[PDB]
Amino acid sequence: VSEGIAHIHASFNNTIVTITDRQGNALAWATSGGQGFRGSRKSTPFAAQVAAEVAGKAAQEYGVKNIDVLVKGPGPGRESAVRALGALGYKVNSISDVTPIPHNGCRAPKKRRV
């Protein structure tokens, strides 16, 4: 659909990249746990790279060329995913970081005593 939004929900464990249209209707999506990487490999920038390639090329059937990416989360694969999307024929309009930050809202879980 020519114009689309990439959503890179990067996290410490897994990174999920989904391309939707302007009104937030998903076209294609690919994660790192569904690409052959499990456990330690899933939390790697390369896994996010291949997830971004799979999702972006699978959404290119719909005809999207101009994409604006929206990164969210602290995960390792939040720059490699954008690089994979950009170096795949996509035209990046903007790169915006939209990860949610509470203004001292809900209480966080207790500290891990490892």
Partner RNA sequence: GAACUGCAUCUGAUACUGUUGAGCUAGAGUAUGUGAGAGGAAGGUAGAAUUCCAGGUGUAGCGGUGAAAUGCGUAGAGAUCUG
74 sits near RNA (criterion: CB under 7 A): no
Binding residue (CB under 7 A) for RNA from 16, 50, 67, 81 = 16
Q: Tell me the number of residues near RNA by CB under 7 A.
A: 37
43 sits near RNA (criterion: CB under 7 A): yes
60 sits near RNA (criterion: CB under 7 A): no
Q: Which is nearer to RNA, 13 or 65 (CB)?
A: 13
Distance CA 66, CA 19 (A): 11
Distance CA 86, CA 80 (A): 10
Distance CA 11, CA 77 (A): 8
What burial letters (b/e) apply to 63-81, b meaning 16+ CB within 10 Å?
A: ebeebebbbbbebbbbbbb
105 sits near RNA (criterion: CB under 7 A): yes
39 sits near RNA (criterion: CB under 7 A): yes
Within 77-96, the residues that bind RNA by CB under 7 A are none
Footprint of RNA (CB under 7 A): 5, 7, 9, 11-14, 16, 18, 20, 23-29, 31-34, 38-40, 42-43, 70, 72, 100-106, 112, 114
